[PDB]
C-alpha cells in the first residue's frame, strides 16, 4: 500500500507481450464499429511485438488527481469608501454560489453529468494600498445559504453570525481555508439538468433550477480607515473525495453566462478549436 | 374510562368524564433528596394537614372572557397549614396538582386551554425596562385578569394574551404542560407538576416557580338563558411540601 | 525542534470550530447539578409535539387569538371547500408553528408530517369534513372530486373530537430546502365538507375546528443557518 | 486523533460528544 | 463510535416499513388532543405505504450543534484620546456580563427555561488608523468579578491583576479565545426568573436578579501614541458542553432591553411576523 | 513537517494559565529544603481559626482596641437586646476578620459558620444571654420574642464561658456571592438578655463579652478575585 | 511546549497539496449516495472509447459534419494516395478527440493507439485500401509503396465493415510530450487503395468511410496540466 | 486521579450528616477558648440537620491557586532619547529585584511569615509611537546578580553576556517568559525579617538585609533611530510549587516602601478599611 | 504519518485513496 | 496530555500537583 | 526523530541514506 | 520527552550529559 502509493504504482497499466506471425482463419482486427461498442485490438494482434515490461501508472488518471486541484473561481472586490460607510449594497459583497461563473475548470467538471465531493476552499485576500497607509484591515466572509438574511448592508444584524460560518482574516495571519461537506438534496451535484422549474412558458430550465446554495455576503469589520483600499479577494476550489457519473463530450466552444450552454457568440461566427488544412493528402 | 378519582388530604375529587391526566415533564413530584440537596436543616414536612385540596376564588366564562391566570406558590398564601409554613420559613419547595372543574351542558359549545408555565417572566404593558410590579404578580386564590380594567400608573403587567403575556405566539403555548376543555367531551382538566427550579428549594415569598394559565380558545356558545352562568373552578393540592429555615414570620401584603 | 509546516487556514477564526482553549479560573468546581425535570437533547423532541396553527391568517383576526380557530359554518351549498394552507413548512401561516420557527434555523427539511384538527363544536352535533393533500405538480384545487383524487382522509366528528391526518413524504429529492423554492414545493392541504353540519334544536350552527400540526419520526431537518422570521430592527436597550 | 486535553480543566476541551 | 461519529449517523431516525389496507376497527387516526398528549400516527398508518430505508441523523438537532455555534454579544468601543489619558471612565471600557444584550442568539436560548454550560470566547479586536500609523497597540482584557475593584480609569491599581484574568493581545498575534466554567451558585443558568430583589414594592423582577456575573474593564496597554485610533474588540460567544430543561415557544417579537420580555415598542403597533392572506379559501 | 494548525488563542498571554518556560539558570540545584514547623495547604485552615470581631463598630472607639469588646450592661429593663451585626461575611463588622479579609479574594462562599463568644466578665458575676441567627427572609428583629422564633442558642454563663453559635447553611443557591447583593443576604445574628447580669457585692456591674467567628467544615469558597478591603492608594517608594 | 521549528514552506499555498481543513458545517450528515448506472474512476476509461475524427480537415467542410466523413472516390489512376494525418494525438484533425481533447490536459503521453475504420459504403460495394503508420524518423511518405515498407494493414471491404489498424510505440524515451516537439515526433499514418471500388450496377461510385481512434491497454498520461484547445477570451456572463 | 483533578475533586468537604435532639449532659457548644485553641462544633451538634451531601472542593483554596496567578510587580520605562546615546545611566534600565515593590500581590504573600517557590516571569513590552514609524526595536532583558557588572550605561561590556541571562525580543515576535529555580542561599524566602545588618546603631533592619538579589539592567539593542519611542516592558510574576508555613493576619493599613512595614501616613490619619456604625443594635 | 484525522467530520480530510 | 516537561530543570514545568 | 514522511509523494523526502 | 534528536547530524543536539 505505502510502496504503491508512495512510490505511485497503484493502477498499473499491463506489459506488451511477444508475438509470432499468424496465418489463420479468425481476424480479430475485423470488428463492427455499428454495434456501438468499442473494439479490443492490441499490439499483440495486429504486429510482431516483442516483450516490454510496463512501469506507468495511471494514478494520476483518476477523477481524484484530474479532479482534485484548487482552482479561480470567483474573486470578490471590494472598492472600499469612506465617505458613505454602510449606505445600501456597499463595502460589503455578495456573489451566488457557482462556477459556470468561470471557464478553464468550468470546462473540466462539464466532462461529466453527475458529480459529487466535498470541497478545500482557500482564501486569497491581496490588500491594494490606495492610501500611505493600509493599517490593520480585518475581514468577515460568510455563507448565506437560503433563505437567510442577507446583509442589506454591511453592518446588518446577519454578520452576528449566531449560527452561521464566519471565517475571520487579520492581515499577516495567512490564508483562510476550510472545508466542506457536500451539500446537495440529491445524491450528487446535477453538473446538467434537462428540467424546468415548471410548465409555466416563462420557467427556468437548466443547472440551476437545481443549485440555489447561497450566496456569499462579504464584510470588512474594522470600521472606517483614514487612507483607502482596495480588497480583492480570491476565492480558489478543490474537489476532495470525487465521484463521477456518465462522461460527456468536453466543450470546445467559449461559452458565456453560467447555468447555460449557450454558445451562439454576439455576431462572431461560431469559433472552435479546429484548424484548417489545404489537403487532406498531406499533414 | 374517563372516570377518575383523586385523593390528596381529608379531601377527595371526583370527576364522571376527563381527558386523560397529565404529569408535567413526565415526573411526578417528591421530596427532595440529600444528594441534591443544599441547606442542611431538617424540613419540617407537614404531611395531609398541608398537602391537601384547597379550592380556590370561582370565576365566570363569558363570551367576552379573555383569559384568567393564577400565580402558585402564591395562589395558597392563605390556604391554611401550608400557607402559614410559607410565611414562617424562608425555604420552601413543593409541587402540585390542579383540578380545572368547568361543566355546562351537551348543547353549549366552548374551549379552554389549560397549561402551566415555568418561570412565567411576564411583560408589561409599557414600553420601557419597568418590569411588572409584585403586588400585581401576586394576586393570590382571586387570580389576575378576567378581561379586567385597573392603574396605568402601576408597573402593570401584560393583560395582553395572544403574546402569551411573555410576547411568545400563544399556541406555541401548548410546548408547556397542558390540555383542553373541550366542553363536548371534556368537563376537566389535570395537571399534576414536580419542582422545577435550579435550586433545590426557593423562597416562596420572592419566587413563584409555577404559573398557570387558562384561556378561552373558542368563545362559550349557547342558546340559553344568560341566566345560565358557567363558572371555571380552579383546586389545587401542593404535594411533597416540604419547607425550612424557620424563624419569626414575614407579613402579609 | 520539529520541523513542522503551518497550514493554510492556520490563525483563521469560524463560529463554527471544535477546538479546545486554555480555561481562565483554573481549579474550579462548579456548582454540582441536580436533578430537574425535563431537560431536552434534541430538537426533535420539540418538533414533535403539536403546536397550533395561525390559519385565520385573515385581516384584522390576525392580530388577535381567533386567528387560530377556523368556523365551520352554514353551507346552503354542499360539497363546499373550507381552508387550505400550502405545506412548505417555512410559510405563514405555517412558519410561526413551534416547527416552522425551528425549521427556519435549518436550510433544509424532510419526512412526512402531521396536521390534527379538533372539534370545538358541541356535543349534540355532527359533521363530516374531507382533508386533502394535494402533493406537488399542480395547483391547488378548485374543487373537490379534484382534490380527493389524491391523498385524504374523510373525518368523520364524533365522540372522539380529533383527527390526524399524515402527509407522507413526496419529493424527488431526499430533501427538500426550507427556503421558498419553486423546485422543493411540497404541495398543499385543503378541506372541505363531505356532508354537514347538522344540529339539532337550539344549538349554534357554526362552531370551530382548531388545528395542529407536530412531526413524524420520518422527521429530520440539517444544514443550521440563522432565521427568517426574526428581524432585529433595533438595536436593545437597558 | 483526539482525547488529548491538552488543557488541565474540563470546561476547556471540545464540543462534547453524543450518546 | 469512530464510523458513527465521524460519518455523523449517531441519532439515526427509523424507516418507513411497508403497509397494507386496513377494513378495521381500531381507528389511530382518532385521538383527543385535548389530553393535551401528542398524537403518534405515522405515515405507515394513514396510507399505504412503502419501504423505506432511510439514513438522516438527528446529530446537527442537537441541544449542541444548535447552540453550540459563535455568536457576537458585545461589541466593546474605544474611541481613544491623547489629549487627556486616564481621567475618569477613559480609555478602558467596562460592560455588564450579559446577552439579553443582543438578539439572533439572545433568541436561541431562550427556546428554553434552563441551560447549563462551560463557554468558548474569542476575542476579535480590530484596530481602525484614524492617523498616518497605528505604532504597537497592546491590550488588556480582564474580568471583574463582583465585587471587585473595577477600574475608575484606565490606570487603577487594578490592571495588576494580582489575583485576576487578563488575557493581552499585541497586534499581529492572532485572536484571544479561551474558555470557561460554568459559572453560577445556582445549578443552572437562568435563562428566565419569577422572582424579584425583595417585598420592596420597587425591587427588581426578573433575569437579572440573577445574573450579576461580572463586568468587564477593559485597557489598551501601551501609553501615549501620536497618531489616534480607534478600537472595536468584537466578543464572540459559544456553548460547548450543553444542557437544556423545559422548552418554551421562540419569540415572535422584536425585543428591546435586556433582562427583561417587554415588547411594547415606541408607538409603533406590535409587529409579529405573521402574514395576512387575502382568503382562507386559497393559498 | 507536521501540517499544523495555529489555533484562535495562540501567541496570546493569561495571568492564569498552567504553561512550561524555558528556565534560565540552568543546572540549578537549589538550597535544600530543611524542615519548618509549621506549613499550610490551604487557606481552609486558616479560615478555621477563630479571629476577634471589631463590633462596637462604633464612632471614636473604632480606631482603638475597645472596638473589639461588647459591654454586657445594667440593663433596668428586661428582655432587653444587646447587638446585632449581619452575616454578610464581607461586611464590615466581619469583613476585616481573617475569614472576611480573605473571603473577599474569591467571588463566592458556601457553608456553615461559627459564632463564639467569651465572657471576660468576673467568676462571682453571673448571667445568661440569648443569641440568635434570623435566617435571611425579613428585618433584623426589632424585638427577642420574634427573634427566638428562628435559629437561636440560650448562654448560660458558667465556669465555662465561652458559648458558640453556629450559623446553619441556609440558602436557596447552592452557593452564595462574597459581593454584597440582596438576593444572596445571608440574614442576622444579635444577642438579647435571658435572664440579667447578676453580681454580688463590689463587684463591678458592666463587663465585657469578646466574640469570634472561625468556620466550619461546610465552609467553601471559589472563583479567586482581587480583594476589597484594601486599596492602595499609593504608590509605595523606597 | 514543544520546541518546534517552523519550515521554509511554511504558511505558503499550492493548488496542488494535501491537507486537512476545519470542516465549518460540522454534524453534517450528507444525503445518502444512492445507486447510479455508470460511474468513472478512471480517464482512462474513456480514453479507450472511439471517438470519431475530423479529417477532412478541409476549408469550407470544417464548420460543418462531413469534416467527420472521407469519400473513397473514383481514381482513374491506380495505386494512388487517400489521406494522411499526423500522429501527434494533440494535433487537429486529431487533438479535438475525446483522447486529443484530454490528452492537452497532461504534458506526457505514451502507449500504443488505435485507429478504426468503417465503410459507410453500400453492401454490393468492394473496396481494398492498405493503411500504414510511418514511423517517426523521415518525411510523410509521397508513394505508397514508400509507405508500405513500414507499419501497415491492408484492408479488405467486405461484410465484415471495420478495420483497426494498430499504432506501436516506437519511440527512443518511455515517453513522448504532448506538445508539439520536433524531438517526440509520432509520426505519420496515410491510407491508400490496394485495388479499387467497384460496384456492379447503379450503385453510387463515391462511398464515404468514417475513422476513429480510441487506446490500447499499452496507454498512459502523466504530469497534469491546463489545456489547449480551450481559451476562454471571456469573460462569462450572468 | 484524572477525572479528580480534572473534575476538580481532589479535596473535596464533609457532607452534613442527619441529626436529632439531645437532652444530655455534655455540652459540645460550651468551650474556653482561652486555652487558645479553636472550638470544633457543628452543624449537626447546634441543630437537627439533614443529610447533605456535599460536592465542593478546596482545590481553588489552596496555596497554589491563591499563589500561582501572574502580577505586575515592575513596569520598566524608558523615555529613549537619540540626542544623546549611551552616556552614563541611559536608555538602559536597572531596578531592584523585589516587590514589596508593588501591593495586590504584596499583600497576598505577606499573609504568611515564610515562603519558597520557583516563578513564570513574563515581560510584555509595549512600544509607544511618538514617531512617525517606530522601525525594528530589537530588546534585552538581564539579570544581575548580585556582585556583577551592572551596566554604568547602554552598552558596557556586559551586554556580552558570556555567562549571563540576556533574552531577545523583537517587536512582533511574542511576549518572553520563562522561569526560574528557588533562588535563596536559605530553604526559603523571607517575606519577613527581625533581624539586622550588625550591631552598628546604624544597621539595617527588615526583609532585605535578606534580599539581594538582583537587578535587572535593561536595554534597547537596536542602535539610533529617527522617530523616537518609549517602551513601557511590564513585569508579571506568577509562583509555581510554592509552599507556605506559618500564615499571618492579612496587611489593612496601605503600606508605602518596600521592604519594610511602616503605614505612618504623611500627614493623613491611619486609615483601615473598618466602618463606622450609628449603633451596635441596628446593623 | 496518516489518518491522523485531526477534524472531526469526514468532510475534512486529505484527498482519498485508490483501490 | 502531560507529564511531557518539554525542558529539562525542575524549576520549569507546570503548576504543581495536589495531594 | 525519523521516517515521517509527512507528505505522501516520495519526491518529497529528506536527503536520501548511503549504504 | 528527549532523545528526539529532530536533526541528523550530531553536532546539532542539546547540552550534552554529565555522568
Ligand atoms: C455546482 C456547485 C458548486 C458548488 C459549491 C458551492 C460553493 O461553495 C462555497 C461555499 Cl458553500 C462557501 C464558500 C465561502 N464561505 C465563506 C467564504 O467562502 C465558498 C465556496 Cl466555493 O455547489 N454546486
Ligand atoms: C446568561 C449568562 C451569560 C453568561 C456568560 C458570562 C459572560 O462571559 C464572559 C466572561 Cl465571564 C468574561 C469574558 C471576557 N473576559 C475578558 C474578555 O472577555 C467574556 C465573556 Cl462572554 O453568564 N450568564
Ligand atoms: C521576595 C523575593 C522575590 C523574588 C524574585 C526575584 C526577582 O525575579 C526576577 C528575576 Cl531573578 C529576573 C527577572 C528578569 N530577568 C530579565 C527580565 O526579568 C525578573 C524577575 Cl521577576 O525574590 N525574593
Same mark, same amino acid.
Given at each position: 500500500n505505502y510502496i504503491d502509493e508512495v512510490l505511485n504504482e497503484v493502477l498499473v497499466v499491463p506489459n506488451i507481450k511477444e508475438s509470432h506471425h499468424t496465418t489463420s482463419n479468425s481476424a480479430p482486427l475485423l470488428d463492427a464499429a455499428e454495434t456501438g461498442h468499442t473494439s479490443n485490438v492490441q499490439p499483440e494482434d495486429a504486429i510482431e511485438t516483442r516483450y516490454v515490461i510496463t512501469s506507468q501508472t495511471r494514478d494520476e488518471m483518476s477523477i481524484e488527481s484530474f479532479l482534485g486541484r484548487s482552482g479561480c473561481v470567483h474573486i470578490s472586490r471590494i472598492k472600499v469608501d469612506y465617505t458613505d460607510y454602510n449606505g445600501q449594497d456597499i463595502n460589503f459583497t455578495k456573489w451566488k454560489i457557482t462556477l459556470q461563473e468561470m471557464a478553464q475548470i468550468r470546462r473540466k467538471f462539464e466532462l461529466f453529468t453527475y458529480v459529487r465531493f466535498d470541497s478545500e476552499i482557500t482564501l486569497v485576500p491581496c490588500i491594494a494600498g490606495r492610501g500611505d497607509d493600509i493599517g490593520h484591515i480585518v475581514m468577515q466572509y460568510m455563507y448565506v445559504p437560503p433563505g437567510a438574511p442577507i446583509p442589506s448592508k454591511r453592518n446588518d444584524f446577519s454578520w452576528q453570525?449566531?449560527?452561521?460560518?464566519?471565517?475571520?482574516?487579520?492581515?499577516?495571519?495567512?490564508? !483562510? +481555508?476550510?472545508?466542506? !461537506?457536500?451539500?446537495?438534496?440529491? *445524491?450528487?451535484? =446535477?453538473?446538467?439538468?434537462?428540467?424546468?422549474?415548471?410548465?409555466?412558458?416563462? *420557467?427556468?430550465?437548466?443547472?440551476?433550477?437545481?443549485?440555489?446554495?447561497?450566496?456569499?455576503? *462579504? +464584510?470588512?469589520?474594522?470600521?472606517?480607515?483614514?487612507? *483607502?483600499?482596495?480588497?480583492?479577494?480570491?476565492?480558489?476550489?478543490?474537489?476532495?473525495?470525487?465521484?463521477?457519473?456518465? !462522461? +460527456?463530450? !468536453? +466543450?470546445?466552444?467559449? =461559452?458565456?453566462?453560467?447555468?447555460?450552454?449557450n454558445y451562439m457568440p454576439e455576431t462572431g461566427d461560431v469559433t472552435t478549436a479546429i484548424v484548417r488544412r489545404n489537403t487532406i493528402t498531406t499533414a | 374510562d374517563r372516570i377518575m378519582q383523586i385523593t390528596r388530604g381529608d379531601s377527595t375529587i371526583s370527576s364522571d368524564d376527563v381527558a386523560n391526566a397529565v404529569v408535567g415533564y413526565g415526573v411526578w413530584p417528591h421530596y427532595l433528596?440529600?444528594?441534591?440537596?443544599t441547606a442542611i436543616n431538617k424540613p419540617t414536612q407537614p404531611d395531609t394537614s398541608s398537602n391537601r385540596?384547597?379550592?380556590?376564588?370561582?370565576?365566570?366564562?363569558?363570551?367576552?372572557?379573555?383569559?384568567?391566570?393564577?400565580?402558585?406558590?402564591?395562589?395558597?398564601?392563605?390556604?391554611?397549614?401550608?400557607?402559614?409554613?410559607?410565611?414562617?420559613?424562608?425555604?420552601? $419547595?413543593?409541587?402540585?396538582?390542579?383540578?380545572?372543574?368547568?361543566?355546562?351542558?351537551?348543547?353549549?359549545?366552548?374551549?379552554?386551554?389549560?397549561?402551566?408555565?415555568?418561570?412565567?417572566?411576564?411583560?408589561?404593558?409599557?414600553?420601557?425596562?419597568?418590569?411588572?410590579?409584585?403586588?400585581?404578580?401576586?394576586?393570590?386564590?382571586?387570580? $389576575?385578569?378576567?378581561?379586567?380594567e385597573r392603574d396605568a400608573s402601576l408597573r402593570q403587567p401584560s393583560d395582553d394574551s395572544w403574546?402569551?403575556?411573555?410576547?411568545?405566539? /400563544?399556541?406555541? /403555548?401548548?410546548?408547556?404542560?397542558?390540555?383542553?376543555?373541550?366542553? $363536548?367531551?371534556?368537563?376537566?382538566?389535570?395537571?399534576?407538576?414536580?419542582?422545577?427550579?435550579?435550586?433545590?428549594?426557593?423562597?416562596? /415569598? $420572592?419566587?413563584?416557580?409555577?404559573? /398557570?394559565?387558562?384561556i378561552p380558545i373558542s368563545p362559550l356558545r349557547s342558546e340559553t338563558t344568560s341566566s345560565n352562568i358557567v363558572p371555571i373552578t380552579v383546586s389545587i393540592s401542593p404535594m411533597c411540601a416540604e419547607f425550612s429555615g424557620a424563624r419569626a414570620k414575614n407579613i402579609k401584603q | 525542534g520539529l520541523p513542522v509546516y503551518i497550514t493554510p487556514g492556520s490563525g483563521q477564526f469560524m463560529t463554527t470550530d471544535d477546538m479546545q482553549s486554555p480555561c481562565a479560573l483554573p481549579w474550579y468546581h462548579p456548582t454540582k447539578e441536580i436533578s430537574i425535570p425535563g431537560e431536552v437533547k434534541n430538537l426533535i423532541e420539540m418538533c414533535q409535539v403539536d403546536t397550533l396553527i395561525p390559519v385565520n391568517n385573515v385581516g384584522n383576526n390576525v392580530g388577535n387569538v381567533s386567528m387560530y380557530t377556523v368556523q365551520l359554518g352554514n353551507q346552503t351549498g354542499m360539497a363546499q371547500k373550507v381552508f387550505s394552507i400550502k405545506v412548505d413548512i417555512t410559510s405563514t401561516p405555517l412558519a410561526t408553528t413551534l416547527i416552522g420557527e425551528i425549521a427556519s434555523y435549518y436550510t433544509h427539511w424532510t419526512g412526512s408530517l402531521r396536521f390534527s384538527f379538533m372539534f370545538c363544536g358541541t356535543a349534540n352535533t355532527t359533521l363530516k369534513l374531507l382533508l386533502a393533500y394535494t402533493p406537488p405538480g399542480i395547483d391547488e384545487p378548485t374543487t373537490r372530486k379534484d382534490a380527493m383524487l389524491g391523498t385524504h382522509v374523510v373525518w368523520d366528528v364524533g365522540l372522539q373530537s380529533t383527527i390526524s391526518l399524515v402527509v407522507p413524504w413526496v419529493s424527488a429529492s431526499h430533501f427538500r430546502l426550507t427556503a421558498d423554492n419553486k423546485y422543493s414545493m411540497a404541495g398543499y392541504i385543503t378541506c372541505w365538507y363531505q356532508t354537514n353540519l347538522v344540529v339539532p334544536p337550539s344549538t349554534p350552527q357554526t362552531a370551530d375546528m382548531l388545528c395542529f400540526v407536530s412531526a413524524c419520526k420520518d422527521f429530520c431537518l440539517r444544514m443550521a443557518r440563522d432565521t427568517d422570521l426574526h428581524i432585529q430592527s433595533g438595536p436593545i436597550e437597558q | 486523533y483526539f482525547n488529548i486535553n491538552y488543557f488541565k480543566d474540563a470546561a476547556s476541551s471540545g464540543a462534547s460528544r453524543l450518546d
Open positions: 453570525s449566531g449560527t452561521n460560518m464566519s471565517i475571520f482574516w487579520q492581515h499577516g495571519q495567512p490564508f !483562510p +481555508r476550510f472545508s466542506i !461537506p457536500f451539500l446537495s438534496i440529491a *445524491s450528487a451535484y =446535477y453538473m446538467f439538468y434537462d428540467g424546468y422549474d415548471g410548465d409555466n412558458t416563462s *420557467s427556468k430550465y437548466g443547472s440551476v433550477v437545481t443549485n440555489d446554495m447561497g450566496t456569499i455576503c *462579504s +464584510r470588512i469589520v474594522t470600521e472606517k480607515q483614514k487612507l *483607502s483600499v482596495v480588497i480583492t479577494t480570491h476565492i480558489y476550489h478543490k474537489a476532495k473525495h470525487t465521484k463521477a457519473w456518465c !462522461p +460527456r463530450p !468536453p +466543450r470546445a466552444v467559449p =461559452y458565456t453566462h453560467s447555468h447555460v450552454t | 433528596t440529600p444528594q441534591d440537596a385540596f384547597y379550592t380556590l376564588e370561582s370565576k365566570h366564562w363569558n363570551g367576552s372572557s379573555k383569559g384568567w391566570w393564577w400565580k402558585l406558590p402564591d395562589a395558597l398564601k392563605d390556604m391554611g397549614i401550608f400557607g402559614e409554613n410559607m410565611y414562617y420559613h424562608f425555604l420552601g $419547595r413543593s409541587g402540585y396538582t390542579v383540578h380545572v372543574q368547568c361543566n355546562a351542558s351537551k348543547f353549549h359549545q366552548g374551549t379552554l386551554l389549560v397549561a402551566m408555565i415555568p418561570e412565567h417572566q411576564l411583560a408589561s404593558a409599557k414600553h420601557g425596562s419597568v418590569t411588572a410590579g409584585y403586588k400585581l404578580t401576586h394576586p393570590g386564590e382571586a387570580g $389576575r385578569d378576567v378581561s379586567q403574546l402569551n403575556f411573555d410576547g411568545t405566539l /400563544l399556541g406555541n /403555548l401548548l410546548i408547556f404542560p397542558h390540555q383542553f376543555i373541550n366542553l $363536548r367531551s371534556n368537563n376537566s382538566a389535570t395537571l399534576i407538576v414536580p419542582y422545577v427550579n435550579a435550586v433545590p428549594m426557593d423562597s416562596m /415569598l $420572592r419566587h413563584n416557580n409555577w404559573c /398557570l394559565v387558562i | - | -
